[PDB]
Enzyme design. Structure first.
Site, PDB file in Angstrom:
ATOM      1  N   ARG A 158     -22.336   0.250 -24.475  1.00  0.00           N
ATOM      2  CA  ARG A 158     -23.647  -0.314 -24.160  1.00  0.00           C
ATOM      3  C   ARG A 158     -24.432  -0.777 -25.380  1.00  0.00           C
ATOM      4  NH1 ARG A 158     -22.744   3.627 -19.988  1.00  0.00           N
ATOM      5  NH2 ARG A 158     -22.483   2.402 -18.067  1.00  0.00           N
ATOM      6  N   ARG A 195     -25.158 -13.527 -10.515  1.00  0.00           N
ATOM      7  CA  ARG A 195     -24.015 -12.794 -10.987  1.00  0.00           C
ATOM      8  C   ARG A 195     -24.449 -12.338 -12.343  1.00  0.00           C
ATOM      9  NH1 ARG A 195     -18.985 -12.500 -14.103  1.00  0.00           N
ATOM     10  NH2 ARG A 195     -20.107 -13.248 -15.958  1.00  0.00           N
ATOM     11  N   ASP A 197     -23.806 -11.124 -15.707  1.00  0.00           N
ATOM     12  CA  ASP A 197     -22.706 -11.070 -16.647  1.00  0.00           C
ATOM     13  C   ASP A 197     -22.702  -9.770 -17.458  1.00  0.00           C
ATOM     14  OD1 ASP A 197     -20.566 -12.109 -18.342  1.00  0.00           O
ATOM     15  OD2 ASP A 197     -22.117 -12.561 -19.836  1.00  0.00           O
ATOM     16  N   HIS A 201     -21.782  -3.407 -20.062  1.00  0.00           N
ATOM     17  CA  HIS A 201     -22.280  -3.280 -21.427  1.00  0.00           C
ATOM     18  C   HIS A 201     -23.753  -3.012 -21.522  1.00  0.00           C
ATOM     19  CE1 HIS A 201     -18.365  -4.182 -22.937  1.00  0.00           C
ATOM     20  NE2 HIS A 201     -18.314  -5.261 -22.179  1.00  0.00           N
ATOM     21  N   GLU A 233     -20.980  -7.818 -13.030  1.00  0.00           N
ATOM     22  CA  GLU A 233     -19.654  -7.808 -13.615  1.00  0.00           C
ATOM     23  C   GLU A 233     -19.421  -6.463 -14.289  1.00  0.00           C
ATOM     24  OE1 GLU A 233     -18.414  -9.493 -17.552  1.00  0.00           O
ATOM     25  OE2 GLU A 233     -17.899 -11.269 -16.322  1.00  0.00           O
ATOM     26  N   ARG A 337     -15.471 -14.626  -3.004  1.00  0.00           N
ATOM     27  CA  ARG A 337     -15.757 -15.775  -3.851  1.00  0.00           C
ATOM     28  C   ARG A 337     -14.463 -16.468  -4.255  1.00  0.00           C
ATOM     29  NH1 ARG A 337     -17.719 -14.335  -9.622  1.00  0.00           N
ATOM     30  NH2 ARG A 337     -15.528 -13.651  -9.529  1.00  0.00           N
TER      31      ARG A 337
HETATM   32 CA    CA Z   1     -25.548  -4.050 -24.428  1.00  0.00          CA
HETATM   33 CL    CL Z   2     -17.145 -12.239 -11.964  1.00  0.00          CL
END
Ligand code: CA
Ligand code: CL
Length: 499
Positions: A158, A195, A197, A201, A233, A337
């Protein structure tokens, strides 16, 4: 926020990876609206770097510069015009939101940005936002390189840099504010969802704080009290310390096990067999159906070095691919999708595509070409357009028709021939074995003559392709020879004929 906000009973969306706004809006009007698609996912619309070595790669659009809405696909005005035209014909717009980071640490400095902004990635300076040294996670990372070095460590993932990208400090109210203004700007225009991204993280803590700042959708097209759709994601294939469980309460998540496992099934790797897929879905350890977004491949892994690597299926392998996507669209699990790719000169060197960086078809000068429609309704100039394939667009319809109906009437030959039904609304049959498929099956359907939508459609009072006779008892004989260029058959209520 798990609600996709679809209209008119439509059920599926395409990723028009890299298309220009102008092309998307045309495609909305001429094709997507008419053919029942629920919406489009579009590439990140924010300002981004322009990489020159290598020449203008697809992945440059995932290195933001500001939140000004001018990108490779077009400008702010084109963008608005697209949302509008797409919305006016019931096709929702989902946005790829890149917010974990800005550009790469070694991005240098100058005006090499999709807006021609100035910026200095060396001093972490992004005046267009504006952002600055103190808006980044440097102090929080303890890696030698300051990049993620070990995925066993949930803190690294992260707080450190994703392969060198400048990691936004998302605990900071200032940063959270900036990002939300961005997403709100989009929502205000008529966007239906995101979505998100790179979620693996970011901290669920920080994500929620953003999601809670987002407005209700624009009542010009969306009922009052509609919320942005969120899908995230996160890649989890097991063994990951980080699981989709942590995000699943904030919105939907990508189920990467879906395409990975589905690919090795039609490939028949590791002695995996289609017959095994009777309990496909939650049964297979996938997340809960209402949390899931499912797909065969995405822009990352279709280049063979993502989640699933070699087992992922793409337009590069049409025959298996069509069956896989057809299967997905027929099955009730997840929100689906479809991929829409462009091609490029693959060059494998030690099993890695040294050309996997290559961007969309484009004029030298790095601006992307429009999408030309061939008269037989396919695409030119290196755009693939899987979404326009008969065997796909028709399964997109199939999914609309059978929507809501239960999985039913399962059958399998113990190997790689299987079939199943969705209520009394549709039946599909696959033959992935090395001999012919040859059986009578209870389709669960009303008796009559149905048109196989894989090999054609219902036109007037007749079938353009194969057709199938269902007895009053709902029994039907199927013959699919393994020679067949498309070794699977699908039929449904809207493909039936008058008595
Ligand atoms: Ca991050
Ligand atoms: Cl995706």
């Amino acid at each position: 926020q798990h609600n996709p906000n679809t209209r008119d009973g439509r059920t599926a969306i395409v990723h028009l990876f890299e298309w220009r706004w102008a092309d998307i809006a045309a495609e909305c009007e001429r094709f997507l609206g008419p053919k029942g698609f629920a919406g489009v996912q579009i590439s990140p619309p924010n300002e981004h770097i322009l990489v020159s070595s290598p020449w203008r790669p697809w992945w440059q659009r995932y290195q933001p510069i500001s939140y000004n809405l001018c990108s490779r696909s077009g400008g702010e005005n084109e963008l608005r015009d697209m949302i509008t035209r797409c919305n006016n014909v019931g096709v929702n717009v989902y946005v790829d939101a890149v917010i974990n980071h800005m550009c790469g640490a070694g991005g240098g400095e100058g005006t090499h940005s999709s807006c021609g902004s100035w910026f200095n990635a060396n001093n972490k300076d992004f005046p267009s936002v504006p952002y600055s040294n103190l808006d980044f996670n440097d102090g929080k990372c303890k890696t030698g390189s300051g990049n993620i070095e070990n995925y066993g460590d949930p803190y690294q993932v992260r707080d450190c840099r994703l392969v060198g990208l400048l990691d936004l400090a998302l605990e900071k109210d200032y940063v959270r504010g900036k990002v939300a203004d961005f997403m709100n700007k989009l929502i205000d225009m008529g966007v239906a969802g995101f979505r998100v991204d790179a979620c693996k993280h970011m901290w669920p803590g920080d994500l929620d704080n953003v999601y809670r700042r987002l407005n209700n959708l624009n009542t010009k097209w969306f009922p009052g009290g509609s919320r942005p759709f969120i899908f995230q994601e996160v890649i989890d294939l097991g063994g990951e310390p980080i699981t989709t469980g942590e995000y699943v309460g904030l919105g939907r998540v990508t189920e990467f096990k879906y395409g990975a496992r589905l690919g090795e099934l039609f490939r028949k790797w590791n002695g995996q067999k289609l017959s095994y897929t009777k309990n496909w879905g939650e049964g297979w350890g996938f997340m809960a159906d209402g949390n899931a977004v499912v797909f065969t491949d995405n822009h990352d892994n279709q280049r063979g070095h993502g989640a699933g690597g070699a087992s992922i299926l793409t337009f590069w392998d049409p025959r298996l691919y069509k069956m896989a996507v057809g299967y997905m669209l027929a099955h009730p699990y997840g929100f689906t999708r479809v991929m829409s790719s462009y091609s490029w000169d693959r060059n494998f060197v030690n099993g890695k595509d040294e050309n996997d960086w290559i961007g969309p078809p484009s004029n030298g000068d790095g601006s992307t070409k429009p999408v030309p429609i061939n008269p037989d309704q396919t695409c030119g100039d290196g755009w693939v357009c899987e979404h326009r394939w008969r065997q796909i667009m028709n399964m997109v319809q199939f999914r609309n028709v059978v929507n809501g109906q239960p999985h039913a009437n399962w059958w399998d030959n113990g190997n790689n021939q299987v079939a199943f039904g969705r209520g009394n609304r549709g039946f599909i049959v696959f033959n992935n074995d090395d001999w012919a498929l040859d059986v009578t099956l209870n389709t669960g359907l009303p008796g009559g003559t149905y048109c196989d939508v894989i090999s054609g459609n219902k036109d007037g009072g007749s079938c353009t392709g194969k057709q199938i006779t269902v007895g009053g008892d709902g029994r039907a004989h199927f013959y699919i020879n393994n020679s067949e260029e498309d070794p699977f058959i699908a039929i449904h209520a809207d493909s039936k004929l008058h008595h």
